[PDB]
Design a protein around this ligand. Sequence first.
Ligand code: MG
Ligand code: MG
Ligand code: MG
Ligand code: MG
Ligand code: MG
Lengths: 772, 773
Amino acid sequence: VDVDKYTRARNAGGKRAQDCMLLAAEGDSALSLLRTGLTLGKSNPGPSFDFCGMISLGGVIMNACKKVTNIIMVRNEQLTNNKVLQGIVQVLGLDFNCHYKTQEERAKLRYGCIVACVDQDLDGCGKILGLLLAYFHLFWPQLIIHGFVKRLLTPLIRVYEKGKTMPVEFYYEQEFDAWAKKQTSLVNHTVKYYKGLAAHDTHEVKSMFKHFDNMVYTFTLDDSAKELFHIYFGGESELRKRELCTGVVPLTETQTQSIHSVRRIPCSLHLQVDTKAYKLDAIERQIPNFLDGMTRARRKILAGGVKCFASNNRERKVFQFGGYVADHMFYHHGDMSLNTSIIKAAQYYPGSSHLYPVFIGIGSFGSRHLGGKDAGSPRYISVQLASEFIKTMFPAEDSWLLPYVFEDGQRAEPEYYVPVLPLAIMEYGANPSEGWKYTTWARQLEDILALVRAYVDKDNPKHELLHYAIKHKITILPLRPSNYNFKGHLKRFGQYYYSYGTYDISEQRNIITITELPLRVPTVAYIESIKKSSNRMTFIEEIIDYSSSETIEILVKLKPNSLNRIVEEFKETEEQDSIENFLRLRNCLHSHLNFVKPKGGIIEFNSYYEILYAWLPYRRELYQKRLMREHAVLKLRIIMETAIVRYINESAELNLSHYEDEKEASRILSEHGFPPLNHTLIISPEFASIEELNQKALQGCYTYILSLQARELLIAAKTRRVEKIKKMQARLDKVEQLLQESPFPGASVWLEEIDAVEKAIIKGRNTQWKFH
Amino acid sequence: VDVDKYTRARNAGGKRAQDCMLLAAEGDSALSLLRTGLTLGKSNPSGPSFDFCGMISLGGVIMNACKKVTNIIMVRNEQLTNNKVLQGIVQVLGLDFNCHYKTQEERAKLRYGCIVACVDQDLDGCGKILGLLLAYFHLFWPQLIIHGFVKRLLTPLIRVYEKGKTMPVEFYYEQEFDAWAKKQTSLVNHTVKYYKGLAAHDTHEVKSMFKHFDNMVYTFTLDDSAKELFHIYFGGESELRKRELCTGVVPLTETQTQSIHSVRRIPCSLHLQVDTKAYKLDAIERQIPNFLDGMTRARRKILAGGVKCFASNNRERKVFQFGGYVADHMFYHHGDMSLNTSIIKAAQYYPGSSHLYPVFIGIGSFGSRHLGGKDAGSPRYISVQLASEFIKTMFPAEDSWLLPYVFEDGQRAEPEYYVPVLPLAIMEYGANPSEGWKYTTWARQLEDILALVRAYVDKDNPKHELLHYAIKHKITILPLRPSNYNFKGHLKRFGQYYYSYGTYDISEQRNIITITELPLRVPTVAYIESIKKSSNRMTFIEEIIDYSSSETIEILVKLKPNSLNRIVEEFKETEEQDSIENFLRLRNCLHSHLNFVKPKGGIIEFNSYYEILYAWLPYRRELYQKRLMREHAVLKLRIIMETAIVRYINESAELNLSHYEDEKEASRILSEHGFPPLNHTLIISPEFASIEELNQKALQGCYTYILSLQARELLIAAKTRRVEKIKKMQARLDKVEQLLQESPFPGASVWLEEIDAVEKAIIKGRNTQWKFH
DNA sequence: GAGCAGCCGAGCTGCAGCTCGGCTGCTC
DNA sequence: GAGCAGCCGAGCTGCAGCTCGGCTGCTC
DNA sequence: GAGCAGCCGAGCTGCAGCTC
DNA sequence: AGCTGCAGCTCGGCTGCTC
Ligand SMILES: [Mg+2]
Ligand SMILES: [Mg+2]
Ligand SMILES: [Mg+2]
Ligand SMILES: [Mg+2]
Ligand SMILES: [Mg+2]
């Protein structure tokens, strides 16, 4: 058998076939690592190619459960032709018309078992290994029972001590993350994440293959397996919506001891832990958070952009910026996916996902006609922080107070941003995930400004009304779909908004001219869909696309005497006319307002109001958290600057005899009443909590006097320093002035920043989001 | 016509066929940009549209048709007939290979009026890709060039924007810009942009480029010189390229540049002499290494970027991340995928690998000898890490401040070349082609190099005086033998060539020949497949089984019954190749092509490994002088600065400085008291300053070295720290003058000291499989 | 009788698959 | 009048291919 | 609203700290 | 000499004023 990317065991299919293992790795790179370990005469029987074969799974394998129908059980033509699954069936000699119930039939296979060597990320052991188990369970459940399906367990994270040869190994990112927060310090630790099998170094691969047999686990079937395979991989997404609303239930210590002592894993437990953990992670990766409308990748890209560009906004190529984001924000996935999200994050065309892109795209970033799929490759085009928009919408002062994600024991991106405006309902989104779909249509900016200002401005005439409405979850002000960059019409019919294109009829020339398409409808795909209809093309002799870069003009030349037959074979409803029916110039803005909670998990909203009402408390509270901490540091900075002024007012006074070292100089300052200060924390509070700031700022030392430069002893410098103190005490009164406000602390500065975000949006809109 | 990556003009092939343009872009990204400009109702009729413009992709470098023809008539090699890119161009245009297109009627049977090459402005685009396109038409339809059927669209490569001026300055060659930047006082108020592809232009620039589309379309013309020039640059004889690429490109005269621009016509012969030659020269500098450090431009960027990236923390980083760092900070103007491959190749360490002393530590699966390093993981799995102990000893950091540097986009990039402690060009394995020249080297034995270099440097060694007496007369006294590291076989010299041999063992009973070593740089899997491809050799073989370890060889060749006697007969036993070493092709020849790149540019043909080492010695000898001479200058100045500081704090309480109001008044009194005006940043951080610039600028004066003094410097322990610092400085300074006065030349003793340091690192790397754990 | 392939550094690009639900074609 | 596949998006898993250039090897 | 200037803020080198 | 985690230094960016 000569299957692609297959390297046989020497004894495969022979007399000793049932002694052979078929190793199934994720791809070529993992395969090359397995070959590295399978070819040692220094392991002195580890395995070798005498009895071990290799085969590539080609990434995620096809879900056979959704591609079969039982009359018998027939495999649909996509599943029958899958090159990856064909190669496994051929290499193993599997038979689809055999149940493999008897020991004699099982010995007609070309290998004794198949050992899944998937990577240890949730994608590997949860989804890919899950999908592989569902394949065998669907067609040969007997093979699972008799241990024909095994797996190789490898670590996902290794943590090495500086003074220890052997490391501590983890198999789930949760295992590490909990163990790391409960660690006193990781300065003497380097965390390594193994994104694929090919990531282990030579000494680790030798260790992994010396102990190869003690790390092969065998899968078993119970009664719960059959339903669980249907919940996780069946046709009914409702069953996933029920299962994926709760967290993973961990294994009991009695359970983990049985599994490891006999090295057998029931399929049902694998589905409840590994596969479920992936699908939960998959939701957090693809469905955005309702607070800031971002996914994990897009939040990493923004946090990485702020670090990369807020100090120096020189443009950078996309693949370079992707490297920065992946480095500094600890991105554990493929470089090419992250580069696509960067490009899509910066596209600004009529109907694009983002009405307010986080970056300025410099180069060819895609047109409306091809759904932004005609953007240049990541090596030609560059991005640049839309700084004026970003600084007004994501206040830098607030990022210190957000909860943060920690990857590999180090701080990464925020768990969520809390922007000044409800970004989750101000943009276009549409993509699926596990269990839930996600689709949202951007609300009108003026409707959003009206809602938030009523909530915040005490002088608004609907302020008290809105608060009484939020409490009972009623609606008083409209939240209409946005019409910006849309020349068509929006109409409401009952509970649904509809988007309409625009057309012109010239009865003489017999041309229908489409001058706008429905919302988010790409031009080239639209024209191709009207040629794929035999019904409609009977009346069309030609379609010609004269559209601008970003305006629509399609010339539909009709066949002689068809306009009268069109009105007949296409009905005219009170909500759509016959030509709008003929040319499919109307869609429905169906929403799937499923989002991600701050502390994890899905959340099903019922209206755009509910999202806005849920986001308000987080933005309200952050303005308080911000002002409360600016108060704490200002209090502290005045203490530090007044202490410095009093020192240099007494400089020649305290230095009255020569002192030996820096610890003696601290004797003199302590006895004279100068406070020991942690100047590093007072100048740079960073992520310190107020309770931690007060605790640690005053337990310090006196570097703030000893690092003082002689030039700060000058009179002109001193008056500069003392007027700085006036600045801070005027500010501190203003700060606690703002804390005392109605309806809540910081209401007036929230209003100030809403005007700043509006001004930035207007400037960007007037410049096609270029800001030049 | 349904061709891949083709978008027709609406009038193509119709009544108005000859009114249509076929725009030929490099690829999809460039194609999508042209579609952006061809679809404006805000520009035009001033600009073109899809009414009369079509587009098609050239798919990067196009096939060189000149090397795929033979004259029987002229037959096209069957690989050239099946080239999908050139097939599609002929289809779209309706071109006929049996048609001369001499008359206006024949040319009107084509489906377009002309073809406009819209290539990028890098030398790859206009020099290579556009050159090969012109050579294609010149080879088959030269009449089409004469009648102006082959045109091109000129776009800028570099744009410089001023922070007051709205209109930028545009350049069409990187050299024209580079000169314009050296003649500028400062470009601090300028943003330079390099446009590696068409898709790099922004929306406002593409709009500007499309009003003046017709004013930027140039037409090609044929001369009498064209025929010979097309053969020199694209013909079958590489000898003609070796002749042409020995000189720089001779620029166009102002008379030539004015005629070309006034009529928008470009002679083919002139384009080949300027654009294509400029590429082929750049291609040589990119792929042929410099003989001083054995590196190419990409690998030097990768090392220079590695030092910057890793000097803060040698924490490993994934390859694609490090590649992004290098491309950003070292100004890499090329594809992301190429740079990522060169990073991987720079870190491979297996028997027969290119590098015996890699600059990085590969962490993960980086490839085996069995697959020629082609089984390395993708750049997203594997990580790199500076081989710091090797790098610090081989490329001394003090020297990098004193090397010449290349400046890209007006900013300092990687060094022009490194000058390593040992002649790296002859210590590693290389083999790849370029334009005009091939490159192949086989690593010399490290011990022979250490023996030769130490003799040159060590005054107290037999025989220092002998070797120098030999270099003058161009003799060779000590051997430079091929390296044996990671090689189980034997090396033999026969005439002008060394040969490497594999090893085999015969078990007459079991009838198995077991190959236990292969020739140098021979990958295992490809070797086995070549003897599976021979019917001559497989007549005697019943099976081949590979039991080889990771990096030791064990191939079991089981023979057919009674063939061992037919082997010794049906092959040959030479005094140089045993029948079985012949039967199993266990011998290669160490063909060398010691072609390199000179400092400050150009190729150079060496004839032996000694000459390369002899050429490298003066650069390393002199650099040790430049190094010590500048450390002397900086030591003198730092001593002046620290003694002035000591005197200040000894007089601090006397001339107390809280006494005066302003900062410039405090410097007046300090001036009046004799304290010297010092440019403290330059004495503390000289960086890339030459001594002549150091001496000129050191006394520019500031007195910040006193005003920035922290209160802690008034402490007893701090001042005593200063005088022990001053002592150590004066000492070092005395030691420096000893090293400057040394024989045979300045710094001989530290060169020998550093040769020991690099050796210890090489030994350490070898003892740890270049992992250093 | 050329052609195929190998290297490095470059110029361009291309697929398989998962998830969900609305629509539209198709099919029976 | 009622069944399937097909498509699509984001974010993921995993890969593939055509060229130039110089010389030497191999088979053919 | 755009120059001009001064000061702020954190990204990312510098320089102790602990070696070996 | 020689990392490398901290702290601290730098300068492009803001922020104020003025024209
Ligand atoms: Mg993986
Ligand atoms: Mg995580
Ligand atoms: Mg005093
Ligand atoms: Mg190009
Ligand atoms: Mg350059």
